[model samples]
Target: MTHTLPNLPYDIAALEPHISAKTLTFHHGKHHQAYVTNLNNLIQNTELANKTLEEIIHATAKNPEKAGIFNNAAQVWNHTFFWNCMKPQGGGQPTGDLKAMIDKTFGSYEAFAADFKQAAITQFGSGWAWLVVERGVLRIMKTPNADLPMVHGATALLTCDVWEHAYYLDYQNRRPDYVDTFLSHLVNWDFASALLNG
Candidate 1:
């Protein structure tokens, strides 16, 4: 199936203060839309075009020659997931099973935030930080340039796009400050909780 761009779950301006409206306008309207457009162009009439997004990603992930297809497809997938990982006034601690899991896995909510922030801070270049579940264990990992955990035998629960495009307009070069605000004010615990235990 061809990929279509998804509207933001909230208004473009809803994530203000932590994430300015203008930043989201370009990030979603341009960056994410571009990925969907490029992926469609790359796969047009090809055998892989009819496959599901995940199918296309897995099929092309290891093929050195399919790098372009893989990059666009993964970016599309990553951005979609990243958008869901946040919301208006949404960060804080978790509750219920998600909370239990976080405490058990990373020892505490503070610990999890620290580890996740560290992953975001150390991504080094355009990429993402993720909280994922692998064989029932919660873990945090950072991927450089359009990579994600789903292709690596894990189910993603949360994500933070560390790409400069995600924050440069709002925070200049202060990725850590952006990440801190993300952890405190933008992370959607409910979205992540559903993915973890649903």
Candidate 2:
């Protein structure tokens, strides 16, 4: 199927002080949209063109020759997932099963937050931080560029895009501050909870 940029789950400005509307306008309207547009152009008239987004990602994931196809497809998938990872009044704590899993896996909510932030902050460049289920155990993972957990056989529960473009306009040279605000004010626990439950 031809890919299209998915709409932001909320109005562009809804993310507020943590993420300014101007940032999102370019992030979604330009960056995310560029991935979709590039993907279509790259795949047009090729066998991958008619494949579902997941199919395209999986098919190209391991082939170095398919790197262009994989990069654009995965970015589309990643950005779509990243947008749902937050909400306006979100970020406090995970509850129920998700909470249990986080506590059990990381020892405590604070510990999990620290570890997760570390993953986000330490990711070298143009990558993402993820909360995923790998081999039936919940874990935090980081991937560079357009790579995602699925390529490593994990089920992603939540993600934070660490790409400079994700925060540069708002946070500017301060990825840690952006990540801190994401965890405190933008993360959608409910979204992670649903993915965990499923």
Winning candidate number (lDDT): 2
lDDT per residue for candidate 1 within 1-198, as digits (tens), equals 378999988888999888989999999999999999999999998999789999999999998899899999999999989898998879879999999988888899999999999999999989999999999899998999988897899999999999999999999999999999999999999999998866
Q: List pairs with backbone clashes in candidate 1.
A: none
Stretches of candidate 1 exceeding 4 Å from the true structure = none
Clashing pairs in 2: none
The global Cα lDDT (0 to 1) of model 1 is 0.92
lDDT of 2 by residue, 40-151 (tens): 9999999987789999999999889999999999999999999999999999999999999888888999999898999999999799999999888999999999999998
Q: What TM-score does candidate 2 get on C-alpha atoms?
A: 0.98
Give all candidates' CA lDDT scores.
Answer: 0.92, 0.94
Worst 10 residues of 2 by lDDT: 1-10
